[PDB]
Design a binder for these strands. Structure first.
Lengths: 208, 218, 129, 83, 23, 129, 98, 71
RNA sequence: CAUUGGAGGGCAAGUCUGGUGCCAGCAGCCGCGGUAAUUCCAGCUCCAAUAGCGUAUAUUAAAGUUGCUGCAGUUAAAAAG
RNA sequence: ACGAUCAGAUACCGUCGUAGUUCCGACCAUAAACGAUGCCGACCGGCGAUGCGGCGGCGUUAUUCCCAUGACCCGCCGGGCAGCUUCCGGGAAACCAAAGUCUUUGGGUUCCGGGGGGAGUAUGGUUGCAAAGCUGAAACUUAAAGGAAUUGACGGAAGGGCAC
């Protein structure tokens, strides 16, 4: 979003966007992703629009900051491929994380232990959170999600166009989304490049 | 004595919200009864419709459980239904009471064609469906009373719908889905789009957003 | 020999290996005489099986990251490992080849980067039919 | 609304959904009037004004909601980028 | 079975046809 | 043969409308369904629209709006004797607060209120809401 | 009501289809309705070709197989265990005998 | 089929008449058989002469022997 | 001294009592009488209009169970091979 | 027809076997002639696979071929042959992209059902050599016949643990 070219397209994103592999999603396409592509290979994959990607990503940041008081929004997966990323996003953001194992009824069943009252739902992927996405359609709380050319896209209100298969691309996405959201919050006045590097959000079998 | 649990009902006790409007703008899942048992304190006029037992057949004395229809109204525009299945007639009655207390649905009212006075009926010609019963509702002016079977008669007067023509394309002898259909018809008055409509609302920010002050507490 | 064990010991283990763990034994005899003081049960039948399954727990404790118990050592060590020092990886890797299709796309953005024009053009027939 | 002589047509104004130019009913669950923060565009920082989005509930199942709010944001002018 | 209900009717129809045509 | 592009308009618009597309394109057209479009505009149900010129059928693109429910087409083509007008009003269209049955007669195109105002009736072809 | 999708035969866009007859059953059914397996094997249905090789002119010969288009009727398939039933949805998905 | 043209009455009314010829509430009062075979010629009364008095059986569910007269 | 139909639900009143014991009768529908009968015959009591009440048979409405408004044809009776 | 099978087996099952199965000429007009589901017309989600023609040409491959052109190759289009999933929506459900765009009742138009039985019967006509086909009531017995789905038990239906 925005009319500030500094938040908008800069080399500061591409120098890492091309490094990860952010310009390739997957072989096939569902009929709700055509908005976010410009070219096609001769090789069987679709190369997404990273500009539209940053566009709706900044809209995602807008949604995340319209959280007037952060204590009340869930960032969720149940797959370890983004479990680390959601943990380390929530730890630094303040909104609560759920990852690995979910329990239907936490924010749907009226009577429940860990009866949590979110106010926005963040999911790593619709193919990754079947039941929580349905429950987000059940209770009036908006939904933000990554979106591949392959992926089913149902009930998605805020779309982030990128491949969500890979630790490298998804780690770039979390690691730059954190900076973008805090940027539009204003704690980051373009003073520094952020010292955390994308290897931090490429999932690890922890032996360190 | 009594305590809220869910955030919205806890606010409603925390009365900073005064009307069901700050809810039925958003169509909120109001997952606890006592919200509208705060909104009202008395005058909750009821009627215990009926008891239908339903049983499963086994090798032994087959197992039967009873369903009790009851309805709530205020002769003004508030109306609702409570349907509960229980071991006993007593528990069925109480479950119908609670479900009918939570199931309240206010209605968009109007006239038979007049533009003065106090609204008394559906705005226009509508129809409500479920089961096999399609009940077509038609308004009716002053002096025209209630034109129904007992079920639409009640569930319109108790809906504050005073004068009315009912029509049925299906079997009213099927009271259950008859009641559900004749309540869906009342429920859908906001579906039509009129020149009295067709604007853009002012987005009176969520009870949550405006009143976060208590919302971050637990 | 033996039998598959019950909830009264599943709970009695996933409480004590949670709290008493660091103070919990390493072998059966120790486990049982720990149970004598810091267990409250109406028998010795439950106590013997608690001690046997705690023997099982120490069999399972130092056995690598183990998914059948939970203890402080595990909790901290995994969190601390995740508390990590990214090696020099902002560039994410060394020199990058990319496709002319991606270059022509990034022409719209009027963008480039460290580039080598990876050529992978012709196809040999594709997804199986 | 409540007209002067009592031409009462609204008991109130239900939350209208503009993402598809269609009205909804009283008992919905996917008609979500989300808020969106406004920027200062001296640093891009959040500032105290609302860009709102309330789509009719049913379209979410079709999964057009992303596209509709794309159109809404572009029109709203907080999103200007177009390829 | 309706097949042999029909066959019974067929045979009885032949009976009545001949008993009527005879005289 | 293919028939009644008026009916086909009233089916195609309602085919696309509940699917929610902002505008619609219809292959055939006529000056008279254009005239229904204009009567629809005078109440504002639809917006402005474009008339794509291809002498073969004439295509119409028209915007759909939340000002509408549906509009019916009646073949056979009756006549309103100006006795039956109130009958048709009360038995076809859902509302006297909006929606006004349509008539082709000897005083121009019109909907039933304006028809009654000029005191001339005729054929029913349309009724909207 | 119909507890099948194409009713166990592939007549789809075409007229009445040829007959073929079971051999565990000697019953005639249309070819679309029938069940068709293609079996190949060696002569002795076990490893006796090792014995055949033990005393042989050539060491062991290239073993011309037997190829057969095995036919069953539906009911002989049931009696002789080609397949069996599937769930009220699991009939939809397929896994023929290898 | 179900056709709906305007001047169709030559098909409409005659086919409708023919398709009316199925209701009991039509047959039982629009062909001579009903009147000419009602057990009497049609009267709320049936005066006559008793010729004997007997008992009539019932079916064994409600077993009974009711008092019936041949008129 | 004013009655005519009821006293099970449907369908407006008694989980009425002596009987009688599937017995007569009631029940247009269900079933009720097969000794611990809310359907029979009587006593009180109550239900419904009322100088009325039904009985019985033609007539209508309910009806979208004639489809003109305005039917259905996979399975329900229904589409010529 | 004959051996067994079995109280009956006139049957299954085993052995022969006229008519039938075969051809040609004229009849015979039927059924689960079942997608039990008219026909013409438009539209409404996708693709995993399909068949022909017209067609855009990376890389294959073949004739001395680039340019004639076969198999390819990723595919567009047209109406064709289809499966899968999806709340598009309808119904009582199974389910069906049609059994959808139906009370928010109407693109056009041939067949046709009116509670069950009596009954495809009588009767009359008409074709048939024949058996029958088309045509088609009535008195009379009835307040139930009927479908759709859930639970019990049945199964010499199968697939799995277990009892001396």
């Amino acid at each position: 979003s925005g009319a500030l070219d500094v938040l908008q397209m800069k080399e500061e994103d591409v120098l890492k966007f091309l490094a990860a592999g952010t310009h390739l999603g997957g072989t096939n396409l569902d009929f709700q992703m055509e908005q976010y592509i410009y070219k096609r290979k001769s090789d069987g994959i679709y190369i997404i629009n990273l500009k539209r990607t940053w566009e709706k990503l900044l809209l995602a940041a807008r949604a995340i900051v319209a959280i007037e008081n952060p204590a009340d929004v869930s960032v969720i997966s149940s797959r370890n491929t983004g479990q680390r990323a959601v943990l380390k996003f929530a730890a630094a953001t303040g909104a609560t994380p759920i990852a690995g194992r979910f329990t239907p009824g936490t924010f749907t069943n009226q009577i429940q232990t860990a009866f949590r009252e979110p106010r926005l739902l963040v999911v790593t992927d619709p193919r990754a959170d079947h039941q929580p996405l349905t429950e987000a359609s059940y209770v009036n709380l908006p939904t933000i999600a990554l979106c591949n050319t392959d992926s089913p896209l149902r009930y998605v209100d805020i779309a982030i166009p990128c491949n969500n298969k890979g630790a490298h691309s998804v780690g770039l996405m979390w690691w730059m989304l954190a900076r973008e959201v805090l940027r539009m919050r204003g704690t980051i006045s373009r003073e520094h490049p952020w010292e955390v590097m994308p290897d931090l959000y490429f999932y690890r079998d922890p032996e360190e | 004595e009594w305590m809220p649990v869910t955030k919205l009902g806890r606010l409603m006790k925390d009365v900073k919200i005064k009307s069901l409007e700050e809810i039925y703008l958003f169509s909120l899942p109001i997952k606890e009864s006592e919200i509208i048992d705060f909104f009202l304190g008395a005058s909750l006029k009821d009627e215990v419709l009926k008891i239908m037992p339903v049983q499963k057949q086994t090798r032994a004395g087959q197992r039967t459980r009873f369903k009790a229809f009851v309805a709530i109204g205020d002769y003004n525009g508030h109306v609702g239904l409570g349907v509960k299945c229980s071991k006993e007639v007593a528990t069925a009655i109480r479950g119908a009471i609670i479900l009918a207390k939570l199931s309240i649905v206010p209605v968009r009212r109007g006239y038979w064609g007049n533009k003065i006075g106090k609204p008394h009926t559906v705005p226009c010609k509508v129809t409500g469906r479920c089961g096999s019963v399609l009940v077509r509702l038609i308004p009716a002016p002053r002096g025209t009373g209630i034109v129904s079977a007992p079920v639409p008669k009640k569930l319109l007067m108790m809906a504050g719908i005073d004068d009315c023509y009912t029509s049925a394309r299906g079997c009213t002898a099927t009271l259950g889905n008859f009641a559900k259909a004749t309540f869906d018809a009342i429920s859908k008055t906001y579906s039509y789009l009129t020149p009295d409509l067709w604007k853009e609302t002012v987005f009176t920010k969520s009870p949550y957003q405006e009143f976060t002050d208590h919302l971050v507490k637990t | 020999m033996g039998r598959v064990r019950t909830k009264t010991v599943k709970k009695a283990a996933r409480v004590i290996i949670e709290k008493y763990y660091t103070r919990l034994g390493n072998d059966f005899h120790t486990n049982k005489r720990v149970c004598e003081e810091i267990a409250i049960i109406p028998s010795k039948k439950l106590r013997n099986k608690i001690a046997g399954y705690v023997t099982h727990l120490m069999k399972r404790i130092q056995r690598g990251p183990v998914r059948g118990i939970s203890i402080k050592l595990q909790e901290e060590e995994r969190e601390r490992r995740d508390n990590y020092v990214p090696e020099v990886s902002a560039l994410d890797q060394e020199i990058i080849e990319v496709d002319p299709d991606t270059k022509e796309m990034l022409k719209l953005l009027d963008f480039g980067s460290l580039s080598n024009l990876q050529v992978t053009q012709p196809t040999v027939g594709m997804n199986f039919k | 609304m409540q007209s002067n002589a009592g031409e009462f047509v609204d008991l109130y104004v239900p939350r209208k959904c503009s993402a598809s130019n269609r009205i909804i009913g009283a008992k919905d669950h996917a008609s979500i009037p989300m808020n969106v923060a406004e920027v200062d565009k001296v640093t891009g920082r959040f500032n105290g004004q609302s860009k709102t989005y309330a789509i009719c509930g049913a379209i979410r199942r079709m999964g057009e909601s992303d596209d509709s709010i794309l159109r809404l944001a572009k029109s709203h002018g907080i999103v200007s980028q177009n390829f | 079975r309706a097949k042999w209900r029909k066959k019974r009717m067929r045979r009885l129809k032949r009976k009545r046809r001949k008993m009527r045509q005879r005289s | 043969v293919r028939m009644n592009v008026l009916a086909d308009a009233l089916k195609s618009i309602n085919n696309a409308e509940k699917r929610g597309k902002r505008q619609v394109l219809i292959r055939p057209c006529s000056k008279v369904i254009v005239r229904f479009l204009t009567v629809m505009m005078k109440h504002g149900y639809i917006g402005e629209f474009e008339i794509i010129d291809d002498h073969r059928a004439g295509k119409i693109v028209v915007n759909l709006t939340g000002r509408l429910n549906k509009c019916g087409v009646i073949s056979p083509r009756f006549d309103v004797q100006l006795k039956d007008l109130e009958k048709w009003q009360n038995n076809l269209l859902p509302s006297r607060q909006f929606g006004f049955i349509v008539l082709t007669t000897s005083a121009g195109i019109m909907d039933h209120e304006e028809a009654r105002r000029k005191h001339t009736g005729g054929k029913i072809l349309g009724f909207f809401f | 009501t119909k507890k099948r999708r194409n009713n166990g035969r592939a007549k789809k866009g075409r007229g009445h289809v040829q007959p073929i007859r079971c051999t565990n059953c000697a019953r005639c059914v249309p070819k679309d309705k029938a069940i068709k397996k293609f079996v190949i094997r060696n002569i002795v249905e076990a490893a006796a070709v090792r014995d055949i090789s033990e005393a042989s002119v050539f060491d062991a010969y290239v073993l011309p197989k037997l190829y057969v288009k095995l036919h069953y009727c539906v009911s002989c398939a049931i009696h002789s265990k080609v397949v069996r039933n599937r769930s009220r949805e699991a009939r939809k998905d397929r896994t023929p005998p290898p | 089929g179900k056709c709906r043209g305007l001047r169709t009455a030559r098909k409409l009314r005659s086919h409708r008449r023919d398709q009316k010829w199925h209701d009991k509430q039509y047959k039982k009062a629009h062909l001579g058989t009903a009147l000419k075979a009602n057990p009497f010629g049609g009267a709320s009364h049936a005066k006559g002469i008793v010729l004997e008095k007997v008992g009539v059986e019932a079916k064994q569910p409600n077993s009974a022997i009711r008092k019936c007269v041949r008129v």
